[PDB]
Amino acid sequence: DAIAEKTLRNTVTLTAARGRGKSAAMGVAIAAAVAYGYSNIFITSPSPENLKTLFEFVTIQYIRPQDAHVLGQAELVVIDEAAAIPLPLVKKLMGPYLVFMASTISGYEGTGRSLSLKLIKQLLKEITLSEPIRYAQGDNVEKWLNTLLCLDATLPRSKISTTGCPDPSQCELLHVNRDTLFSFHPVSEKFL
Amino acid sequence: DAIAEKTLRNTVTLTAARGRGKSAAMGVAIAAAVAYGYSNIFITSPSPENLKTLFEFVTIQYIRPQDAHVLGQAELVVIDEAAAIPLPLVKKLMGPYLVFMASTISGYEGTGRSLSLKLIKQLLKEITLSEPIRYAQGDNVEKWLNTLLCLDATLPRSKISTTGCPDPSQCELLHVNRDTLFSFHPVSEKFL
């Protein structure tokens, strides 16, 4: 409910891993706002992405961003995985209305969280959803893939140790080979 | 009231001389259809034309035809002096909705009735308004200008005489000079 001393119209950005319900969340707002009633909505996306869940959960109509550039009808715009969309095009569009920004992270074909921050900075009310709709948390299969795949993001904010977060000190340049991969000691799986 | 066994949605074309009230007529429908209620409307026009009366008589919003080509929101479209708009652009637009087509004729900067028929053929429910809002009919000033200016259209449908309407017979090619203008007899003011 974006109403307040601050503007009510603003940009929301919900980010989460896959299977979190970002789309489903984005679908709710569609009807929840009623054509006549709460209001009418809109939706855009990059090379398609599954538009199917959001709308199925959904007035959803879809004009892709470029074609989207045409005229301004709606009160609340929703863009699925905007991080994928060009900064220039995306920014212009966000200006004419109020938006829900969705983006997948921490998975395959997601967007790097480092880039996500730079992207957010361009604006943002950001929110995150932690639990999967399809399975229960703690699903060992999912844990397995995350660990195998190295889904985990932590370094941008901070490292988990005494150090982490900004990396202070003099920067030193050095090269290392693949072999570092096997050894587990100093220069180990960890460095790579 | 376009509702019937035939489609309710169709194209209406009201044509008339200037000062007939075409715009005012077109304005009425705007509110008469209520956003929520009868319905929402729309309006387009060529190089502008006085948009002022229609809307003042009017939800009127205006996106020019080309920019208009963007998305389809409305139940009843109105285009002011469409004859002025390109056939290609105009036709495409008429397809997506229900429309009121207005056009000025029988005056300065009006559209020739001959062309108007060809234009109509491209479709049309056409209606005409005969009396001026601003003055009483029979205003001698208006009669004067019409006659001076040669506002009168009659030849396309038919000539007022035994002959008129289609021109049958073998076509004969001949030239005549301006001088025909003065003489009033055979080859007179009439031929020119």
Breaks (C-N over 2.5 A) in chain B follow: 58, 123
Q: Nearest C-alpha of chain B: how many angstroms from A116?
A: 31
State in Å, rounded, how far the first CA of chain B is from the last one: 44
Please give the distance of CA B145 from its chain centroid, rounded to a whole number: 20
Q: Does A70 touch chain B (CB under 8 A)?
A: yes
Q: Does B37 touch chain A (CB under 8 A)?
A: no
Contact indicator for B98, B8 with CB cutoff of 8 Å: yes
What resolution, expressed in A, was reported for this entry?
7.3
H helices within chain A, ranges in order? 22-32, 52-57, 65-68, 87-94, 113-121, 140-149
Q: Rounded distance, CA B94 to CA A188, Å?
A: 69
Give the 3-state secondary structure of A82-130.
HHHCCHHHHHHHHCCCCEEEEEECCCCCCCCHHHHHHHHHCCCEEEECC
Q: Which residue, among B71, B73, B77, B93, would best test binding to A if mutated, counting the most A CBs under 10 Å from its CB?
A: B71
Which of B36, B63, B70 is the closest to A36 by Cβ?
B36
Q: Rounded distance, CA A20 to CA A133, Å?
A: 6
- The count of C-alpha atoms lying within 13 angstroms of the C-alpha of B8, restricted to the half-sphere facing its C-beta, is 5
Tally the residues of chain A: 192
Q: Which residue, among A42, A66, A69, A70, would best test binding to B if mutated, counting the most B CBs under 10 Å from its CB?
A: A70
Query: Is B118 in a helix, a strand, or coil?
Result: helix
Contacts of B70 in chain A (CB under 8 A): 70-71
